């Protein structure tokens, strides 16, 4: 990377220590920028969803795969659940989105619960495969809590066959009172739904698909037990990406696990982490890892850097890891704490081929967590509220209570961090547009048409903390 | 610029990183300093009003032109409105200020609304061109809301002919209960008003006037469409300054627009921006721009530097741009975030020939925004409250709803930043005195009689952030 | 110590200026790390309790000695009290913990007061040496305040003989409603109590014992009076460690006191402080001190560095003192302000053989201070609330009121700092597990099996303050 | 000054950027340090009271002169008032303090008002020069507001002749219910009062006296008008020190004024300021100033550095000014914002021969401002509440209202900063003990017996702002 | 309120509020030693042994004294407690002006 003249600080840099100086640009608009990655993951956007139980949902996988990203499945899920999720994701359409389907004679409370599970805002009633109506907001208000679905249905939905150009689907929704376009198969059976914003996003973005034309998906495996058996099972299940993660990637056990997984020669790219040093990245690449995960305790006041003194600023660590990996022909992923598109832009400018997003996506409708309201009716979701139960479901490993208590005494209980729902960006698609707009604006300011060009021509500067007063 | 010995930091400097060391001075008082600019704009003060709809008003233009500054009109206004504003500004007196005029039989609520539109605090009642009385504060309290103006008038106003020496106008107002001096034409018709502070400011300051002896005014044009046609229309309308602005000035489209405007050879100075690099300033000057606008995302936590990683500290960028421009014979304008006179003083010391003030002037009586009170009756004005509507009035460009939504999805909605009215500095004239006093004190501390001398003899030092604890 | 390439700052470093870069590791888990010290103190953990009256209690000594640490007794205590405390500590069991014993016919209010004096949460009723029942929480609620103990007893406690393997003691407590395991002597007399967490900690940790198989303990002596007589009295009383402390250790009076104590040749290791300079450490070691105490005004806003300008950042001072002492064959102790395990980890990485904890342990049940509740019933303890009285009990020295007032006028009154009880870590054992887990995680991240290896292979980096925004 | 190895920052240092590293010390206690200055002012302590109307009172002059300091009188006072104050100060005793005297038949409300004017807490009733009783706190509570003084008197005061050794005066007050010792002349007339703390302070401190054995005092003069005439009048009035102050000392007008004052050759030392540059200090010394005043806008958020960008960190400016002045044989005074003894200690270590205290002393009983209570009865005093009236009493200069308004429009109104009374340090003597204790502790930590030795052997280090998190 | 020596100061504070006298007498071998009054336990160590903050400045008179003179002796006393003792010097009771 290139810095300004004389900008040689005596310390490691964070995302608050660096800034991008505008250069000569010929990019006309944001749409003239290609965001496709070159790390071999097949994603058209640098957005990756973290493999935690509170974010990595089935709807998360489907939506992110359709929008061009990828989602890594939690490593504690059973093989049957991962296989079912992979089959469901690879059984989705590349344009239309799967709506919320309500069978007749169901409880209206279940309909209300399912209504908030997606950002469409309308749940379709289906009988014999045929749409009957759309339940929207305020339809359950005042109505009897024991309603049988088929009592408040509103059969005024626009219906069109699948394969219609989304321009005309947008045109039919210009004066519609409900922004839902039901897409049906030629035989009249229900197939999916569309929206004005959804149609525009389908026309702008490009879904990340495999060689079979199906949505891509990723999975993670633990570092304990027979790693080869789990890797083989996930490869047979249809996983397109394997991630072996742990708190400290630069250890002998991870090297042995990487060697064991690479010995099978499954042909799929492998992601390992996390390390924040050039030596660790080189060792991980030599062990057989194609993608190195970067970021260990990036925050100066995070739980990791408060429990221990171990850590490193994210920017310098990512820069060093990318510099070490590019020579060896590898790639690095930023796995820090991302809360603004600025972090993603700076990570991409540093040389990272992908940026992973963690808790930020937990506060969305499509997340597997349930929506609940505060005293002021503030929509929010309990981050890590149920992740501890999934962690201890596999942490027990059939050991006795004495061993479990001995392990858990030293273990620190992760607190339940409330994450408020943003009313203007409730769905993950709004956050995706936000982040992609930030990245595209960064490229236009720099003057690059693609991510390698952005990394090539980026020029950075250093600023002091006195500007934060 | 000259720095202290050994003060060579490894980073770019902001306004919080630099300080002025006092030197040998022979300036007796603040009044012995000339603040006239040499950039060709004709302003006697380095204060420039930003071209946003929430600040660039007609009263703003009149008051700032009378006090020696200049105001740039918004680029989204229609040609008829800009022509009317220019004619009204060039039809004003060089000494007296235009009062609030109330016709008889009008609603008292309209009188109350018009009362707060200017800092005079008294609205004159005019009939057949003759003043009848002055409505002041608390005159509408308790009185019927359907009053017909001519029911609470107070005909106890001091009246003098236009052309009276303001010293005697001040003398007549020594014991007057209302600080309003009605200035009338020799035929007895109403001409304007004066105040003690207004008379003193008229005797101290010098209005910025053109060759015809009329108040100066500036206008802005967008970068889209036929820039030459708009430039010709504004030149024919009587504009004295043209400003072509955009988020990123260092682009090919701005170079083409500058070449197109310069091809007309209208003879007026041209302002373009914004760039924060020497190469950008040189390219803009070569393209045909006489004045270069400086400052792109100056804050470390601003919306621009949070959306993207693009930006630069204002002080270093201004220094570099001024150093590049002075060789080429050009001039630079500071277009950052100004909230204190210290920013203006440091920008002038860096080498900038003019300092532009943005949202700070939005919280004044003369601003086009309407005054409203909080629960504690705090006077405040909604910054950018109505600027979005004016932006989208021209952003539509006759395109269909699909194109407008496609553009606006990536666009980030600017929030409405409340700006509280300062009770002691409600009028823009008080802020003008504040800023001019700060600049004059800076010159006296440095020991310079004019801005070029201030830039010549200024010596700067660098301080750490530990002083901000 | 080894730093990263180019990381040569022009300032001293604190604990917020440094970070540990992960290296190649072969440590399987946290349990594969040995925390035994090599400073000659005999402690299996680097945790040392400060010698202040509000922390250095009898229960503190017993618990910390059983968990592998050591406690330094206050220097103002009379010789009889120190002898009694030493005998009581050396009369304790290496596995079981001494419970709260209630004699019959006592007041229930006394039982409630004694209940919160230890973290067991149940006070055993003993008559003729035989347990009768356990008083637990909410047993005193609503019951008459004049109860005679033997009216609300709950005789449903699991009883086992002393010497039972704690694995089976854990097994018997799997379904018990009260987590208390009464351990009794073979003759049926009461001997102690155990808990699930206590049994696990006894199986993990290793008590620090002397050559006689009894718990170790430390004591402190002042710098005034006949230091040799006090040292001889404490050595005869059974003290295993002598600490001579003062505000400024690098003074001639401390050198004379060290020479006087070393002239007796008691054979015990001696601790002296505090100094933050290599010259001071060398002088203290030459004078006859085997262990040097480090840290004088470590905080930038502490009372010492606000009263005066004297001080030094803890990290650089500890590094320099350790570098000076290791050549001379000595050892250094970190005696700064420790509030997180990160501080202990960084002090150990710097080269310190032991880390002393001060006010942090004051907010625990086992501390000698009494528990009191705020308006919100927040459990808290008044730090330094009664330490002033103990200081002035010996400060009077039989001098007249004039001399006492003359001394105390210049003396600054230490304020009573409230320290809230952490509900999840009320007992000192929870804090001990927290700190040991942090240190073990640090070693696993570095890749070391013991503290000397951790100091040998540690690689550090420097970060700026902009990451704290 | 000497810094640590490698501590060469690229910025100017404030009081938060530096720290004192302890050195080898042989000073037994705080009392073994001499605080006498060598600047020729004759003060035994480095404490100087600023010349503002809200601090520089008559009681301030008397108390500070008795405790060994000096007070500079405001420059706006008339010559008669300054002469009366000087005569009253030079008519005081070197040991006893002047009590609050109440004549008979006075109002009790006046007695209550006068009670809080001094820190004694008891007002003596005097008739024919003989004490009758002492009015103390709560004596006016419930008593009639129209009491005639001689109705609630408490004639139980200890009386001793003047010249008694304060040791025995302390002894008589051991069991007295009121800590007041009335000192009377041999003829029985009232002469003064004493207190236990006052007697101890008289035995510790040394009053600053002239060649006639009378308390010293200082005065200030403005830079406008005939400076020589005012200097001659103040010299004839008995002033021991002349201070010519202004916002910017490094100006030609101050050079001319200094030359004019030095032409008279009054023989008294002259103080001038303020400058923060070596060139300014050299010019001021060459012009005829023996003492240079240092400090112009020291704070990073002060009113001076918010109005303008002019300023400099205090520490670096003081260091440079002292280095420039010592060669020329001059001396420098720190005139920044002092709120802690740390500032005074660091200024003395930098090389300053005296430290001036400003608003900190405004919040005391002896200050000329009146005591008033908040809603919570918090004792506080309005700083700069009445200083504006005294400033405009001489600012008018007989000019017309037009000129006064023209000057005051640009002038910024200083706000009234409430200063709460510290209950434990209400009197200025408590603050004096606090500051002297801080300075003596600094010297003991450094290991110096006097201020020149402290400046000689001081070794400083630099710390970052990350320690302030 | 009678306090034996070597007792806890917390017990003394609890017993202080058990009666309206406001002062608890310290008794040893039947002889008064001092009176513990309000604010005597504030700031003092919670493990005080009674005989560390005693204030031996109590007015003492034999039982049977006319209460008019007992009132007279308490006119300027700082503590409104009049210790009434038996002729042999043993503690018998207390009195107050209002009492």
């Amino acid at each position: 990377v290139r810095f300004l003249d004389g900008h040689t600080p005596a310390y490691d840099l964070t995302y608050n220590d660096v800034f991008v100086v505008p250069g000569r640009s010929d990019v006309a608009s944001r749409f003239d920028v290609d965001l496709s990655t070159v790390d071999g993951s097949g994603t058209t956007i640098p957005v990756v969803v973290a493999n935690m139980t509170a974010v990595a949902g089935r709807r998360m996988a489907e939506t992110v795969a359709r929008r061009g990203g990828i989602v890594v499945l939690p490593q504690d899920l059973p093989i049957t659940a991962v296989s079912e999720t992979v089959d469901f994701v690879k059984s989705r359409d590349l344009v239309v989105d799967t709506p919320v389907t309500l069978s007749p004679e169901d409880s209206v409370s279940d309909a209300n619960a399912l209504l908030h599970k997606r950002a469409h805002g309308a749940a379709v009633v289906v009988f014999e495969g045929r749409p009957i109506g759309l339940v929207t907001e305020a339809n359950c208000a005042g109505v009897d809590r024991f309603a049988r679905v088929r009592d408040i249905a509103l059969s005024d939905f626009v219906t069109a066959p699948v394969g219609t150009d989304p321009r005309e689907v947008f045109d039919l929704l210009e004066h519609a009172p409900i922004d839902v376009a039901v897409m049906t198969a030629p035989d009249g059976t229900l197939a999916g739904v569309l929206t004005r914003t959804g149609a525009i996003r389908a026309g702008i973005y490009t879904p990340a698909v495999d060689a079979k034309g199906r949505l891509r998906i990723a999975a993670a495996v633990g570092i304990n037990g027979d790693v080869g058996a789990k890797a083989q099972a996930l490869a047979e299940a249809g996983a397109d990406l394997l991630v072996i993660d742990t708190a400290h990637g630069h250890q002998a056990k991870m090297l042995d696990a990487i060697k064991a997984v690479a010995s099978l020669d499954l042909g799929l790219p492998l992601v390992a982490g996390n390390v924040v040093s050039a030596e660790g990245t080189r060792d991980l690449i030599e062990a057989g890892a194609s993608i190195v995960k970067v970021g260990v305790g990036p925050g100066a006041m995070c739980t990791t850097r408060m429990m221990t003194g171990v850590g490193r600023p994210q920017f310098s660590a990512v820069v060093e890891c990318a510099a070490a990996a590019r020579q060896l022909g590898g790639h690095v992923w930023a796995d820090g704490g991302v809360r603004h598109p600025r972090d993603v832009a700076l990570a991409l400018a540093a040389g990272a081929s992908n940026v992973m997003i963690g808790s930020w996506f937990a506060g969305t409708y499509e997340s597997p967590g349930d929506l609940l309201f505060d005293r002021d009716d503030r929509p929010y979701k309990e981050s890590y509220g149920m992740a501890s139960k999934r962690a201890v479901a596999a942490r027990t490993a059939g050991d006795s209570s004495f061993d479990r208590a001995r392990k858990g005494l030293f273990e620190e209980g992760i607190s339940t961090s409330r994450m408020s729902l943003d009313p203007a960006r409730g769905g993950v698609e709004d956050l995706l547009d936000h982040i992609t707009s930030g990245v595209r604006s960064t490229c236009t300011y720099v003057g690059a048409a693609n991510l390698p060009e952005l990394h090539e021509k980026v020029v950075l500067g250093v600023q002091s903390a006195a500007g934060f007063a």
Side-chain angles (χ1 to χ4, degrees), chain A residues 40 216 232 235 239-242 261-270 290:
Chain A
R216 299 177 95 112
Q232 262 274 339
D240 325 292
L241 212 29
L242 293 96
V261 175
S263 76
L264 309 183
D265 196 10
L266 307 183
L268 304 183
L270 187 59
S290 60

Side-chain angles (χ1 to χ4, degrees), chain A residues 250-296:
Chain A
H250 198 185
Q251 62 178 303
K253 183 189 310 315
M254 171 84 48
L255 298 170
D256 295 343
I258 293 304
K259 269 160 193 312
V261 175
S263 76
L264 309 183
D265 196 10
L266 307 183
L268 304 183
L270 187 59
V271 186
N274 310 14
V275 303
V276 291
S277 69
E279 191 183 341
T281 304
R282 284 191 291 257
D283 286 2
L284 260 304
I285 275 175
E286 286 311 83
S290 60
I291 297 161
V292 175
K293 206 152 56 128
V294 180
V296 171

Side-chain angles (χ1 to χ4, degrees), chain A residues 47-50 52 54-55 60 336-345 355-367 381 383-384 417 419-422 425-428 430-436 438-439:
Chain A
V47 177
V48 179
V49 177
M52 339 172 263
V55 282
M60 211 46 47
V338 164
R339 311 292 291 211
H340 298 108
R342 172 207 66 172
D343 310 333
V344 185
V355 179
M356 182 171 350
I357 302 188
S359 67
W360 192 12
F361 281 2
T364 58
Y365 291 124
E366 293 85 353
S367 65
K381 287 191 181 183
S383 186
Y384 273 88
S417 95
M419 308 211 67
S420 100
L421 265 296
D422 164 13
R425 298 188 184 104
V428 301
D430 309 5
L431 301 187
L432 260 283
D433 312 307
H434 194 240
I435 296 155
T436 51
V439 177

